[PDB]
Amino acid sequence: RRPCYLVLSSHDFRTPRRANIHFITDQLALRGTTRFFSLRYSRLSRMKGDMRLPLDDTANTVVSHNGVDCYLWRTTVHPFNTRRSWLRPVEDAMFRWYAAHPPKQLLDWMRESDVIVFESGIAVAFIELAKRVNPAAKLVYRASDGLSTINVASYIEREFDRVAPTLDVIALVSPAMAAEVVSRDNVFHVGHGVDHNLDQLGDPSPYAEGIHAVAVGSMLFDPEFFVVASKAFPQVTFHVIGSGMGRHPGYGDNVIVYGEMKHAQTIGYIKHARFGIAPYASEQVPVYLADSSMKLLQYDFFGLPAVCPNAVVGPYKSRFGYTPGNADSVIAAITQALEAPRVRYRQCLNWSDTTDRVLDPRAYPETRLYPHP
Numbered sequence: 001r002r003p004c005y006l007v008l009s010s011h012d013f014r015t016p017r018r019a020n021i022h023f024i025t026d027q028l029a030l031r032g033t034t035r036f037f038s039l040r041y042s043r044l045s046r047m048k049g050d051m052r053l054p055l056d057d058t059a060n061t062v063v064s065h066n067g068v069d070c071y072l073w074r075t076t077v078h079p080f081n082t083r084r085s086w087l088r089p090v091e092d093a094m095f096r097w098y099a100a101h102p103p104k105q106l107l108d109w110m111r112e113s114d115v116i117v118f119e120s121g122i123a124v125a126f127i128e129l130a131k132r133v134n135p136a137a138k139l140v141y142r143a144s145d146g147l148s149t150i151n152v153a154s155y156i157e158r159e160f161d162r163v164a165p166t167l168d169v170i171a172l173v174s175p176a177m178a179a180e181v182v183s184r185d186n187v188f189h190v191g192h193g194v195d196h197n198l199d200q201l202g203d204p205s206p207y208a209e210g211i212h213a214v215a216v217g218s219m220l221f222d223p224e225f226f227v228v229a230s231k232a233f234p235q236v237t238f239h240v241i242g243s244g245m246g247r248h249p250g251y252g253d254n255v256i257v258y259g260e261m262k263h264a265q266t267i268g269y270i271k272h273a274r275f276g277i278a279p280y281a282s283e284q285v286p287v288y289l290a291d292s293s294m295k296l297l298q299y300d301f302f303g304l305p306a307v308c309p310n311a312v313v314g315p316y317k318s319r320f321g322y323t324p325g326n327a328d329s330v331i332a333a334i335t336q337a338l339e340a341p342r343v344r345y346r347q348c349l350n351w352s353d354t355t356d357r358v359l360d361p362r363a364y365p366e367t368r369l370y371p372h373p
Helices: 020-031 053-058 085-100 104-112 122-133 154-166 175-180 198-202 223-232 263-271 294-302 327-339 351-359
Strands: 005-009 034-038 062-065 068-072 115-119 138-143 169-172 187-189 211-216 236-241 255-258 275-277 306-309 319-322
Touching: 005 020, 005 104, 005 122, 020 034, 020 068, 020 115, 020 138, 020 351, 034 104, 053 068, 068 104, 085 122, 085 154, 104 122, 115 122, 122 138, 122 154, 138 351, 169 175, 169 351, 175 187, 198 263, 198 294, 211 263, 211 294, 223 236, 223 327, 236 263, 263 294, 275 294, 275 327, 294 306, 306 327, 319 327
Parallel strands: 005 034, 005 115, 034 068, 115 138, 138 169, 169 187, 211 236, 211 275, 236 255, 275 306, 306 319
Antiparallel strands: 062 068
């Protein structure tokens, strides 16, 4: 049915506020029958506060959502990194057990698929199974994150090293991820895409007169940034969108705090801002985050100058680094961003062109991270 796709991920396709894997899956759904099988969910997830808990009454059944067949697999317990070295044989046993007991629905979908996409993380544990069920299927690993950054259990790191050479495609969001990938000939660089109609979404402006700065998203969200920034720049209005928290009592009156916004509504706040902010509270982040940050990519699409921690400035112009918790550095970076010109320095492929490269990177030899054949 055109090519049939299966995506394996710890996301569920139905969870509001899409991550990169959702945007890719939207493109898959345009190309053929597309399935999204959600992993690492269990009765144990209830005690931990999993974002998929609203979908619990649909567990272990197929639900159609936006043209995609979705399945939230719920087991009694799921394997995880206990972060105790003495518990490693228990972990390994739990992971082996998990991988050894796939539901019939997963097996059927694997068999039916022409292409199986595994997102970095728990999906690693099912790569060998996929090869056994459907050796004809193209196996594509989408490295949204490095395994060590997401801190997967030892079992997952070892299994990925073991199976990585067997994958048809290892599609890294950033070349900085390649150092920890134990393979070469099948390793490619395919960054995140952007919406093909980003420029149509930006107009009209949500802002009136004056200087407006924007932050979108809740990742490592640092309210202390805005406590300092709002006081130091009373002439700037700070638009804090989808931060995952409310109005911190230290925010100046020049901070406007918004609830979660759908992707398309955020664009006007981004395009029409003077500068953007990625207020990550910690610099204990991978080198690849400069490339993989979805919010920084959106700013970059418009050439929006950005203020962000030093650790995520990376190989980019128009990003002004500060040290989280250091007020003077915050102030200095904003000062620089206010005077930075807007220039579209970064080339941003749309999601369709991005998906083309994730699926068939060998057709786009510029994606190769190792010597071309």
